[PDB]
Symmetry: C5
């Protein structure tokens, strides 16, 4: 069972595809194991870069393929390196850029909490053939949180485990528990942009929506609400065009629906006030002055949405 | 006739292209057959990964090309593997990411029922040369339905069959029925987002459209319907910009048309009421009070559209 | 002069780029010719798949490059196959996906009639070296026309011809008429989506535009037309964002212009009616009642646009 | 100094990226030179296609790399060909698709005059090693100008010249003037679509904007201009979403700004008319009748913009 | 310690991805070092182009891999060249197109000051093995600033330094300070387009917003501001669709918020004026005439935003 020591260096995490639940990672992989002692020129470690690596493999050098389990497609591999020590030990170093998959919940956008995961596992060698001795992850990030879209919180969670496959090759005894490395990085979304440019004015719209009751005439009260309705549509559009596409409603989406509801509820009351009468024009002096009733009734329903 | 046992592992199904009728699948293929007994180092099965596979083929190893019949373009192949057993048997394992084609009906969006199909067939070897002994599909999915766009329903329907080609080479005996594997996975669209963010407010618009009849004056009744018309246009825009592009109308599309019709019908009636008179301003006391006539007349036409 | 028999199998025609006048084709090519008799293992035809083909060419196997004349870029090639018969004959089979170029007229969108063309020609061998004996095309399509964007009409038109190049090497006798295969597939656009979701409501807008004359007051008549103008703009936007980009106007585009014209003409008349007077407020009783004059005058100009 | 004769065949020029100042070219390159006499099978010219070319270079065939100086990225190379004559001369023929860079001025859009440039230069061989003897360019285009986005005017300008590099190796004598071929193709944009679908209705908007002065009341005059302002915004959006992205304003963009100005100027005058008084409601009978003053004053400013 | 002389030629800097903090660079790299004297054919320098380079490396030619530290993905490499002199020295020349990463602050858009950085470092060889002797950068740009999106200011800033890695191999003496080249190019955004097409009309909107106070009636004053609110939403949409996506607010974004505030503040005062009375309709003769109070009060808050 070959003991493999792994090191991951994370340079950049970007390009989150919400719909695909995907994110891009740039960094380096270092994998170390001890083979049989070699004779290197001089005695210093031998360096074998890109193209030459294949040439060594052909001559019988064992270099196990390490698969990224949760990679979408196949990574852009930059430079490759083999460091061959005379004492036997071998070090493989390579830069990579890949698209990774993970379960991502965006319900509470733009206040998401996400975690970026990497799953490493030998493509063909089982736990008895190849085993992950240890792993360290270096997230050389820091500073300038207000400049980046995501705020990295922890350092990097790590877990070496053994994954069992129940249906595999023509083997039944115990060659079935490939060892898997799982790296987890917690992150929080920078909610500044969405708060100031989306939440805030949307609030002002909903608030100004209620100002329709301060109008004197019934015709004024009613006709103005159609423009108000059309305003919310225009905002929904502005929101939808810029925000990330999802298969579910976010907090903002709910706020939008709330806006439609408030205006429609106002429409109903306005018509009601006018025609619920004991003459014809008996506009209920109190109901027309619900200028304070449902604005705070909206704040009650809004606080109920938090529950 | 070589007996080939196949195994497909499906990891992820995403990125449906409605216009192209296309979807992306990430997973692994396992193919097994029995060749002539080999002499492996020691006696344990020999593993041959990526690059080295070509080398073995060059020395005469028979590795038949299995084409994905319904693939669009050519799949991103990740790691490849050959497992060579001394008793003869050979196992080929490879990860893939592909775009696949299938007939997709989107007429009843967002309540579509779709099925994701995979078609496997030997590229060059006919049924008498190469035959598919059996196939098992593993869809290791489950849980979190309300997080994913699509809800997988069944487990995986499978069909091994023999496909006859009527026009081939200048060969005449019976070498024309290549064996094909067909995998089918049924799926249902998560309609939640479209119901709450599209259907619901659209309904409110159509409903509030009818509130034009509660207006007193004729000028009021008429002018307001122009803003109402403009509102439906703004919504059609908002709808179209976000919804998938299709060469046919969906349920939502029909709802939009219905909205245009309701308003246009109201325009006609409003003008009619005013000018269908026995004086000039004889606005038919009952026709102006069709505030209940066609809202339910719309619910009759709406229920007729279900038939 | 080598006689080459060709067979093209078309699987899918999709992804029309209007601006580039491009379309994507997936299918197979089969090329057959007779070489010098070989000695195959056993006596049955020898199969040579992908990688091994290059190896045979290196040893002197003549495999002539067939260029797609009207291909944009270079096709994604899938699996390749050589079938080598002992009697000499050779069959090359390959799957392809390419972007192809052709003159495409979109003036009468969404009622275009298009034809998809394929042009095959030997890259380096002239008519006296290599000649196309025959060609058959199999468009295995059928059914579900209302599901697909395009409706294939005929079977496939075919033409083998000889193309003369006037400027090549310093060669004079007659090595200049490369033989070219030209496949033509006629198709019609599925106009349903555009009729119901674009043409229909656009018509309703234009028709409702004329309802401005049923307004009593001059201020009502004029102010309302500004909303009406703004409505057409919103529609032009909705249209333009969804419809394909073109360097020329379509039928729909012309409809839009007609919309602007109707409203602008109305604006002119409205102002004219009011100020062409014998006092100040002499709104010409008949010109204000042009509520029927130019709606059918628009139907006369619309029918003139067909001529 | 090897004399190289070059021939470029241009098939298609498309996909202009305005922001990148890029355009796509599909075509063929023919390069000819005379080497030392060979012994070809028989005596006829020997053809060496794609893969086999590398094999010949490895055996010492000199095939100089010709770099496309203004190519963005590296060209999609289709088929390659070497024609080897027994008298010594060599012809290299290859199809290419590339993204090319050139200074592009889009100030006067949609009336741009552009020129598509190609720059060919030997990658490593200087004028004393390799020299471009002659070059002919074939632009096999013609007809259907109203169908294509761009109208090619000339026949293609050519220039062979010598480019001196001042900073190279520690080399001082005269190996520093690589020979460069420069091809120029002049072209004009098809302005039809932008004239009818953008310029024309934008004109109508600006013209109708001035109709605000024919309104009787001050409140009518003022309130209507806010819808008018909103109309220009909607148009700017419609324009911006469809037109190419640029880092500078075009003619159309200026027209938009003119629209904003006209309305804002009207706003100022309207308010001024009302409040510049000798009583309070003394609306200057002449200034309110600037229904003709600044429409033609706009046509004076518009004709000044041409200067 | 091998002395390496580097030369970078920058042809084009384009395609800035604001979200990814990425930019594209086209150019050439020249690397020079002196090896052991060779015997070249004749005596002149030997040129080895693309494919042939690998062949030389296989035979023991040392060609050290130089990694682009801040590259996203892996560069499109064009033509490669080796120049081998007999005196020993070796010159490697290659064209590249890459996506590079750097900290980019876009807060003060469209008046950003950015700097494009390139970081070069040997992939495997430390400062004692390989050392950067010198570097010169040639930015052959100039002229036509008003045609390009970015205006290059300086000539490039250059810095050779030694980067120490703290966690490496089981090596302890001092093999840890790889030598790194850092190139910096300062640039300024061309603000013309955003000033004239965004800032200017946005200003006119805000200015015209304040014209609501010149309206006589309270109903006019209030109802008009709902259109005015809707106008700002339409503008935000227009802005957001065309401007670059960021995770923070820009100057323009702030201007938009200011617009929402101005209108909402106006709404509050308008309602206040009307209902803050000593009777019912005592609209405060001075507060209604704050037609000049807060327009300059906004110019005070606007000037305070600069502090």
């Amino acid at each position: 069972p070959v003991d493999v020591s792994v090191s991951i260096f994370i340079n950049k995490i970007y390009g989150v595809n919400t719909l695909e639940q995907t994110y891009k990672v740039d960094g380096y992989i270092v994998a170390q194991w001890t083979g049989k002692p070699r004779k290197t020129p001089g005695d210093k470690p031998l360096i074998v870069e890109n193209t030459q690596i294949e040439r060594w493999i052909n001559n019988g050098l064992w270099v196990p393929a390490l698969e990224f389990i949760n990679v979408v497609g196949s990574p852009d591999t930059g430079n490759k390196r083999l460091m061959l020590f005379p004492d036997g030990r071998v070090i493989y170093n390579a830069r990579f850029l890949g698209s990774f998959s993970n379960d991502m919940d965006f319900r509470l956008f733009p206040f998401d909490r996400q975690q970026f995961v990497l799953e490493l596992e030998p493509f063909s060698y089982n736990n008895q053939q190849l085993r992950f001795s240890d792993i360290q992850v270096y997230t050389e990030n820091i500073d300038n949180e207000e400049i980046d879209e995501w705020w990295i919180r922890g350092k990097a969670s790590t877990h070496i485990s053994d994954i069992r496959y129940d249906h595999l090759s023509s083997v039944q005894p115990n060659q079935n528990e490939f060892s898997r490395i799982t790296v987890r990085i917690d992150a929080v979304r920078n909610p500044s942009y969405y708060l100031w440019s989306f939440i805030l004015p949307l609030g002002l719209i909903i608030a100004a929506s209620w100002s329709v009751f301060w109008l004197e005439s019934f015709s004024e009260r009613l006709q103005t609400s159609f423009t108000l309705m059309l305003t919310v549509v225009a905002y929904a559009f502005y929101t939808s065009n810029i925000l990330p596409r999802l298969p579910y409603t976010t907090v903002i989406d709910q706020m939008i629906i709330a806006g439609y509801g408030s205006i429609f509820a106002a429409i109903l009351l306005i018509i009601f006030a006018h025609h619920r009468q004991a003459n014809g024009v008996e506009d209920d002096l109190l109901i027309q002055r619900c200028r304070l009733a449902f604005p705070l009734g909206f704040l009650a329903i809004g606080c109920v949405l938090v529950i």
